[PDB]
């Protein structure tokens, strides 16, 4: 009974209210132990679907599309991704000069120290996209190396169709069918898991507002508004405009990508949201060729929401330490924050941990006593910011896929 | 050559003789390094078949029968499994009052103090039944999450069969067929492995008896006879009885379930016995809809043998510690042992580890010096006790499966 | 554009020359960070293919051929492998008495010490050949357990083809197809990756010669000649001969095993070369039933080149230490090095680590101050000796598969 998109808006509005109120009376722990378990289940059920929906769909996508098209799709979507993420930092820097976050605040030094993780070599990150055991890749996480093998196998399936033989032609047929069976099966599960969505959506914002909704006051409120307006200016001033330029109706696009966004926002897992956003692409008739490859890649590569968050936050820590950033340093963030955004995981809370890499680049390391105590205020409300981020991170990928789709 | 059921009975009788003799002359070391490995190969060979046989069969299972039907079957088998587990504890309690194991014996306090392995939250265990990577589930054991994803998968295939499409209807059929292929194959294998069964049976008891046969004398003899006749009354006073009331011939049931029951007794791994118990279920012509779900679920959930074991051993420790248990402390045993038995793994010797959980609830902890030296005497003959447990643990799943089967 | 078998030879010759030049002028680090990655990309690409190609092919192979044939092929190949490995050591010893590596040399003692790894019991290594989760076998490396289960599955698919049922016989057919689909699909992928091979080959020797080429002077040069002249005399005197005897024209055998021999040489992974060496088998038209099972087993069991290397080194150390080995100690190397060779991993540089095992049997342990400092000279030019080893390790697998196929 009842429409599904309504249930989520009701679970979202009611849950955000129920969270705040329950949380302001000090029931931060009563929500976590009682409410959260239902929001947890919603994420768990989705994660389930990620690996099969991604692997199977993309073998069929790479079998259906031309190997010259797939490669063209690739270069087009990377150029899109890179420029959207670059414009996203500058939008968060402009939002950090418009609003002033932590302008004249002096924070309690010596409270908490942090320890930055040494990032692995670029060579190793790049060579690691080619999996040495595809069964291993599936067996544990690893969407990117899966993407790679999938395409290669999909492509090989096509070459086995052109075969003179009959025994080969059929066995290649039999494989691709069954793989597509799983694919089609998965897209059916996501609907069923979307049926639980409202209950899960309710519980998740109830937890986030109950645990952190009470700390969105003071200079942490002004850093919050700087972000959410900045992200709102990313959806309108960038996506709505680039969809208008490419002749796609931007209003009915939000109609088609509603379920992805609300999941991304609440779930705060770009990775987790993948089977919803992938269905949302099939909803709007984009070829399994294109969206099977662009979405999972964009799940990790394209993070406009994160790119922006790391901008406004770099400025926050720079304002609450006294000294401002050079006009040459403002262009040194744009590069590193896009590099940090690419590198960030499609998992909850990973942006703030990756914000540490864009903090050394400007000159204020996270081992510095007072920088560390400033960072800890932001990490205090990170799950509030995380919600906006992920949603834009996800919206960005779908916007891209739609554009590449109309071009071909 | 030769009948196979006879071979296992010869391997069992000869093995337990050769083991008791060799072990009495102190050749526990020789039988461990020389004979036991042949009994291991049999165990290994069985484990092998579990993942593919469970998964592949249950996908077919959930597609084969109505999603409503599977639901009812579930509620029916859970109501079966709980009541049979609760009857099992009370039967062991009467067996621990009929006999007095550890009646007037004092033990050498301080030999070995045991240690708390903190249990995980039930909310987490329950949440853990949903697998976040179906591959990762299969990849490493994990029967329950696989049961989840399997049913879910199967159920989705059914929906693709009712599709208006042709390309969707065929590729879903193709998939169900391939997965059915695997299922069928793993049944064929378990027949093969069942030919090595006698050799592996021989070696397995030969080791259990060599290692622990001698110690089954004195008060430990009384506690052994307590358990065994208690288990015998579970089969004759509960299984034989409930099979009659439901209109299934108890003796033709025991004939068809023989291989399963023997594997279980010798293997002492309710979980390793799964592919034999699953074959046995198919041998009695039961539907893959029913037994594909019930047997793997019951392999972990329904442990009447473990429940009865924990019963008698609670009374054993209580008698060896002097003070008896109240009528309300005995009704407190019933509930905790049900939890402990369900919570107990289908792996060998695991119930003695969960016995500690049912000893905290009465008021006699495992870290208390003289309880710890009383529990060590039990752990000393646990392999002799484990054989019986596992056998009844597994018999009950088949009994329950058969009963729900006839009713449908 | 351009043939492949030409491109590889130009990459190897130009690459071995560019390597030696760059490294002699101290750029051994420059090659390692710049050139080497390309050569690693090749290895990742091949490795990708090993798990699906080995599994899918052998299930088809074992379903393709008679379980009596496969059994016979197995005993024929094991005999072949053990005999050729034994002969390889006796050839190495004859090279190391003809040449005198480390005759009049006395080394700087005490610089470096080594740590002998504790090898697990043979019974444990044998038992672990049966997997306990086939999905865990694939998931992480584990060619041998896969091999085992693959034959089993293949043989079961067959018995399912003889069933009176329609629904069983078609599902058995469907599964076999989809598995075969993948197998055919992987072989095409190797055709593609072999296109990158010359770029990979060029880089991989650039590295090896840059790092260790310059070290091949003095007494270390005399050992390198000893191993190579031996390995050559294994190719001509053992393969070219045993092939002619069995009636396969050797000259065209080398022609059709070119891609494998050169991948093995440059890549140094007997293991990672397998998808090339399995294709090369198919190219000369050997039955899948035979090479699906001989070649992957051979990758781990049959290492003529390693066995030879261990012979000529066991004679280098002993020469540097001063006191010679007995006639009965030479025959003690023959036995230990065949053993060690069988045990030695299909992975780059493993024979050297395994050389310790054969050294202890002659009475010169690796903990000994001066043995450990001579052994570090051998370990210095290892990649150099490893290239030749690996090639001859693989060639004997193809020679064995070829011979055994001709006898049927
Ligand atoms: N939850 C965010 C993580 C981040 O913003 O760093 C995402 O997956 O996009
Ligand atoms: N062998 C028993 C283990 C136990 O009951 O503790 C089983 O798996 O059923
Ligand atoms: N690279 C060699 C290692 C060895 O010589 O043991 C091989 O894979 O065969
Ligand atoms: Na994203
Ligand atoms: Na990212
Ligand atoms: Na059980
Ligand atoms: Na249990
Ligand atoms: Na080899
Ligand atoms: Na080896």
Residue numbers in the entry:
A (entry chain B), B (entry chain C), C (entry chain A): 9 to 416
From the paper:
A prokaryotic cousin of the ASCTs and the EAATs, the aspartate transporter GltPh from an archaeon Pyrococcus horikoshii, was first crystallised in 2004, revealing the structure of the SLC1 transporter family. GltPh is a Na+-dependent transporter that is selective for aspartate.
The crystal structure of GltPh and EAAT1 in complex with substrate reveals a direct interaction between bound aspartate and R397 in TM8 (R459 in EAAT1). One of the main substrate interactions in the EAATs and GltPh is between R397 in TM8 and the side chain carboxylate group of the bound aspartate/glutamate. In the presence of an inwardly directed Na+ gradient, liposomes containing wild-type GltPh display robust L-[3H]aspartate uptake, with an EC50 of 82 ± 16 nM (n ≥ 3). L-[3H]aspartate transport by wild-type GltPh is not inhibited by 100-fold excess of the neutral amino acids tested. In wild-type GltPh, TBOA inhibits L-[3H]aspartate transport with an IC50 of 2 ± 1 µM (n ≥ 3), whereas the neutral amino-acid derivatives GPNA, benzylserine and benzylcysteine are ineffective. Thus, binding of aspartate and the expected three Na+ ions is an almost fully cooperative process in the wild-type transporter.
